[PDB]
Symmetry: D2
Subunit: 475 residues, 4 copies
């Protein structure tokens, strides 16, 4: 078995200490990492391994039973202090990596837990000095991947000029979730969902990502990006790609991402008449943080028109999806947390039940709870021939971040955004973002803890989604 | 509201006193019958209303709370004695009905609770004497409807020579069942079951009717008919009609039965190579009645070759169902009681999961514990890309006999066998029955309480059904 | 071979002498008739077989070569004079038929070449007297089959109370045409036309029946009926049934007509907003009869609002045809003679040719120059990838009337109107005709020899047909 | 307009003088070339422009009408003598091309009319020296592209290590033909061919490429490759890709070639039991060249087992084409010249015409006499409901080589083989070629001018093509 080096650049970061070190700790605890794996930190701060332990222990969730295993894990941890644009520091880091046991032929896995501003310099210096000559070299890149098409293209071209596509792992936490990964099996392993997954049967597709909390203090970081860049551009667009994607030639990462980019290439730029933007305000009847609006945050610049809610309608102009509205819906400070995929089917042609039938709906809920159910019509128990709404419910381990790190280790790139997919997403959403920043349109206020602006429901009804509300469900 | 007269002719019979009088009582108690309803008996034996009450109270399921309603219901009861082929007795019956309040313009409902041996004279005399000149006159005919094509045609032609098709209600108890009626709503009120309900997606259709008990003493009655005449000719064939039926022009009884006859007309005569026959033997390890075989029943003639189990393969040679085998499976003294419709779908074209996928199966269980579920593949919780078997479960008043009698009262003929339906069924099953009764083939023995002969499973596998056995289910 | 008697009542009429006698003559000349066939005329006016021959020979197309065959044909011809409501005259007719050679056991074929005003009396007398007790008895009934639903139902009930549905042959010469009969073979014998023959691929259906001549003197006959009763109710509706009908269980006449009536039962009543009516005026620049308008006919009542042109939109509200408009267009004094069926298909979904693609069209031209072609896109010969409109063309005996008479002889009722089909057709068109006859709407005038009112084209464009005009065809 | 330099490497070759110089001559004559276009030759043998004239005007198709334009064409011609592996000679060529007017900024188009033995050196030295710094540089590479997967991978890796994929134009003279390019418009611009172009409707696909002549005096050259490498690996495989490919996202060359390689990736390696090989023998009753067999050629080594005929069956294991056999048929010295795409459709489900219907066939004849027709069933003019086979027939400039060169000039790579396409084709056909070369199986002899071995027809029948032979066609 080959040896591996997990280089954590910016190991002093909050993201590092709270998510990366605990994740590799759990992976080593479960015996999932390669046996010969060395964790090497790298940041400008003068820190030590004890200095690390002190900062990472309360997030480690370490019970006293496995203190020996924790000591064994932290034995292989090491830290190098250096600057992100200092060739001498990068040479020192490379020398230290070669100083570890069998470090010259080790597989190098650099995790860039850094702000995007230093990504170019870090990648350039890594490619210059710290690349292994025998093993592979894979780089984990964190969002944001630029703020528009031009900046994203600049960063992507800089990274791609040095590293191959198989060496770049743009990490998205949402792509590793079980229901998100179950979408391909649900679609392509079942005959029941095959013939109906087209424009001849589906009336509209609704993709939802709701959060019940606001900016909760760190509103200044969210102000410069907005909800479209936060959620719509990546989460909902990956959901759309999985829902609308053709069947791949195989389960290979290249084939899956080829289908995803092919679907993305058939989407036109978003227009402002298909977009509803909202910004949450305080709830006087609420408790705690519900009473504070988006602008009530001191870190948020005054007079900000950043949208905390967005509802856009996309169209995939291909054979399978021509004319089917794809409604992307997300927001913050909403009434509940939910990540959902909903397919509303057309009315049954030649209805013989006197307009009593409702549209079939297939729902794939990703969170809070995993649930795949289809709403369908069934005969009402009684005397007359009246259908009523019913439902078929689907009846029925490392977490998503751990599986993503294991995917980087094992070379599976199907859960990571490719360069062409990123370019297509940015080209889809860039004219709208440019118009928004140029004109500063006022978002529609909505009360903290509500469902959002009513204009979103109006847009859904206009594009084709008919909400009934008469469907009653009991657990 | 017009007056209705329910003439239970044969009121001294076991079927009458055990099912018809209690059903009429329950319908009257719930108020489902019209407010002006008179029940008139007719049989050779000389009884009275007191005698009928005495012999029907044990099966009455009455309570002391509504003894007043009991006495009110028997207040409208009456009885005319006489011969079933006596013009004077039928004149007396007609005169009694006229002497009843509003009895000349009253609707007359004749229930023929008599052996088919007298049906000819009974119906002829009813038409000649007891026909009402104002209200409608409908006759309820009980099984058997003949033993083969020729006898059934004789009886049906004689009955139709007197009564119109809208006056004949050939009753079978299973068409009034909840899932049997829900099949049409499931098929034609839902978009998700439309495009897949054809030969391009469905590999085979299995219609199952299993019972856990044998002839239990009355084997002489079953010896004259056999399992094919008892179950396949009516129950499983109605199931096949409902499953393979085209969408009717409307929910009218004429349209529904027209579609059913159209489906029946596309089925060729049953061939012997597609039939597996079985006769149950005793279980040495059984408990009580289960230890006696079919030939171990006094009433059963020695050397009888009457099959208690049958498994035939039918084909609906039309555009929707060409090449799809319809497997009709029924038997007695089997391992369980079950009426079920199972659709097995084809393999997903262009498999990308390395042959790990299993065929989708839609199951509609009429009884026991009615349920609709689809066996389908879902992603196995883990790291690798492997599907696993799961299912979507459908989640969630007078019974079939009173619903059928209410249908006769209302004039709905949807759940009653039409003359052309009967003719098509008999022309389908008549060459096989004649061959069986001529060559006297020996049925394959199977132990009381088993799944039947293994030749049935071999036939299912040959025609295309592939059983897996790897699908494990827990409530 | 059994002997046949062909009774032509109204043998002195123009229809008889110009179509029936020549047709029987040609059938006998070609040997298509049964060997022992006798032709018996019947009319009030007294004449002889010599008079019939003298008055019918110009239309006989007789040549000196077959003079002996002509004398053999007239050796079997006979004439009987009598009233249409005289039992004595009908007894004399029966006696003549019986005195004919093997006339008591012959097959009797009554052609009612009479106005419908005496149809009831003729049929009643036929049933009372002239029925054959050994051979079959079939009557041929000519249009009009009533003026509305009520009159049609009255006449149909009178005829059906005396004759079975298998004895009534309501003759419509349009159903006997080659392309009209080839519609079924084209639809149900070809895999290419199967999957596309539904609402998911067809945008609209146009049924056209144009005539280039006006009433031509006999406008008084046309005034009380109009174009809807003349052409729409029978020719266009039969073509609609054949185009929209489901696949029959077999090629039996009963199955085909069951499918036709099943389609007719799915069509709602015609609404006035889906109807364009027109009445032609004279062409001042025309030559001959083209200069006279509809009202210029002296027999036409002054100020008549009878429409010589109609364009209605019908909808077949079933699974296959839900939402597809069926445009029925017929008119007199138009620019050409044409009987055509046109299916315009939907635009290709996800078009990759920059909107250069035109809708596919399947055209079945019944007359003149019966041709089947489909307009399709092909690559333009050149350097760029531009599709251009092209087409696939179909490439290379008794006529319709003799075919229909032979069908009556051999007992095939496929190309004849059934009672339920007639009832559904009048159900569809009766409220509109009543509204027209009550409100007396003024038809849109149009010039003799034109394409009709432009409101018809506007209605087609509104309901969904898009005329291109860029399609160029060269013979 | 930019200036272009068309460098003809190996300009003294037979291919050059017979096809390339006439093609650019015609392009310049018709004003399709760029206005500033200089043609430069380069070969080891010391010729001049006068020698090029003396050797190329026999095939120039030049008439005295355009003699001035001819002399203007060779006014822009030039010739440079040098070795194909000489850095000094290639520097001299670069100096000449710079000395051309505006040759420093000119677009460079290197046509490699050379044997593949020197391709590596020529490409490496072209990249080293003769690459423009402002204009683009495109290289046209001729077949063969290696003899198997390993050699093809070697050559492709060597070429791609220097030139980008957008700079390499692997020329296949077949992809530029009119009928070949119309396949994509026929499939994706027409709704009539959409729903039926799948496995649910198509029984088998036959791809044919027949020649009526053997290997006239060049059997020694054909011997080293064989029919599979000559025709099957490129022509028939490109035809298969065009027939079976999914709809591209757009008409971009990259999208089209991605679809093509995606289809290629779904094909497994060819098995020997699906391959029929043949080698033509002399015809004793033939005339002239037909009397000599393949081994009668003195250039053919004695005992050669090279196949001049091949019939293989391929399968595209994806959702659209799973189970449909793709029969590739090619051979030399056959009965005719023909290249054709034939799609035989399945039998119509639920036949109601008593097994008289034949399978529909869609035929796209690339050459000779480009035609598209669909064999289909139509009613036989007569008395009975009897279908008979008919056909819908498609109805009534630079050549393929000129259009391919113009495509290179315009930068269109749609009709050129990509690296992944070549690699996938060699992967498909390499195990079979290795097995043939190792085991040396004897090809089945067939007579010059016949249809080939009967084993090919047997294999077609076995895989599913049912030849009828009852279809009659007249022009
Ligand atoms: N649970 C069931 O029993 C059951 C279930 C399914 C279907 N059925 C069908 O329902 C029908 C009702 O018959 P059943 O079950 O009630 O049997 P049943 O009791 O033997 O016959 C009903 C009554 O008819 C009279 N009867 C019997 N045999 C007769 C004969 N040869 N001729 C004239 N009258 C005769 C008898 O009364 P009188 O002596 O006064 O004439 C008898 O009480 C039968 O055809 C049976 O096939 C019954
Ligand atoms: N080519 C056509 O004209 C044509 C085409 C299609 C359908 N039809 C239908 O076929 C039927 C035949 O009519 P037709 O065209 O032949 O015109 P017709 O001459 O008026 O009818 C034919 C015979 O009907 C008799 N007749 C006329 N008026 C009568 C009346 N009030 N009472 C009793 N008998 C009367 C006459 O016989 P006697 O004078 O000897 O009593 C006449 O010879 C019509 O209903 C017409 O709608 C005709
Ligand atoms: N019509 C066709 O023949 C045809 C058709 C399709 C494809 N192709 C492909 O195109 C390529 C062009 O070859 P060709 O048909 O033109 O035959 P060719 O005349 O023998 O080769 C072309 C020129 O290349 C030079 N040459 C020949 N052998 C050479 C060698 N071992 N090493 C270096 N240079 C050599 C010669 O010029 P110098 O002696 O002056 O250097 C010769 O005139 C062939 O490989 C063939 O696969 C040919």
């Amino acid at each position: 078995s080959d040896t591996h080096i997990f280089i954590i650049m910016g190991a002093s970061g909050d993201l590092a200490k709270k998510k990366i070190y605990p994740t590799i700790w759990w992976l080593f605890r479960d015996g999932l990492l390669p046996e010969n794996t060395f964790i090497v930190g790298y940041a400008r701060s003068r820190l030590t391994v004890a200095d690390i332990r002190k900062q990472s222990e309360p997030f480690f969730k370490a019970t006293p039973e496995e203190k020996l295993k924790l000591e064994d894990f932290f034995a292989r941890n090491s830290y190098v202090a250096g600057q992100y644009d200092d060739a001498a520091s990068y040479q020192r880091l490379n020398s230290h990596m070669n100083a570890l046991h069998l470090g010259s032929q080790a597989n190098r896995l650099f995790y860039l837990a850094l702000p995007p501003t230093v990504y170019e310099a870090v990648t350039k210096n890594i490619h210059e000095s710290c690349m292994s000559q025998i093993g592979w070299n894979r780089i984990i890149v964190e969002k944001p991947f630029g703020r528009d098409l031009q900046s994203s293209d600049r960063l992507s071209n800089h990274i791609s000029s040095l590293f191959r596509e198989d060496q770049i792992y743009r990490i998205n936490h949402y792509l590793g979730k079980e229901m998100v990964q179950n979408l391909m099996v649900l679609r392509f392993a079942n005959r029941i969902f095959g013939p109906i997954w087209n424009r001849d049967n589906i009336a509209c597709v609704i993709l939802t990502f709701k959060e019940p909390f606001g900016t909760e203090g760190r509103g200044g970081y969210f102000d410069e990006f907005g909800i479209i860049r936060d959620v719509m551009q990546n989460h909902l667009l990956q959901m759309l790609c999985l829902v609308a994607m053709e069947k791949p030639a195989s389960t290979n990462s290249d084939d899956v991402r080829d289908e995803k980019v092919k679907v993305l290439k058939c989407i036109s730029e978003v227009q402002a008449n298909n977009v509803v933007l909202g910004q949450y305000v305080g709830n006087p009847d609420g408790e705690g943080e519900a009473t504070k609006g988006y602008l009530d945050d001191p870190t948020v610049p005054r007079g900000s028109t950043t949208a905390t809610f967005a509802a856009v309608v996309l169209y995939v102009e291909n054979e399978r999806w021509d004319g089917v509205p794809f409604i992307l819906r997300c927001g913050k400070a909403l009434n509940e947390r939910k990540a959902e995929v909903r397919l509303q089917f057309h009315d049954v042609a030649g209805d013989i039940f006197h307009q009593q039938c409702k549209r079939n709906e297939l729902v794939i809920r990703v969170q809070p709870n995993e649930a795949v159910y289809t709403k369908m019509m069934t005969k009402k128990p009684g005397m007359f021939f009246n259908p009523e709404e019913s439902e078929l419910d689907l009846t029925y381990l490392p977490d998503a971040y751990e599986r993503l790190i294991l995917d980087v280790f094992c070379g599976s790139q199907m859960h990571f955004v490719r360069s062409d997919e990123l370019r297509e997403a940015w080209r889809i959403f860039t004219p709208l973002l440019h118009q928004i920043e140029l004109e500063k349109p006022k978002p529609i206020p909505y009360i903290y803890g509500s469902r959002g602006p009513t204009e979103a429901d109006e847009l859904m009804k206009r594009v084709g989604f008919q909400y009934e509300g008469t469907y009653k469900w009991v657990n």
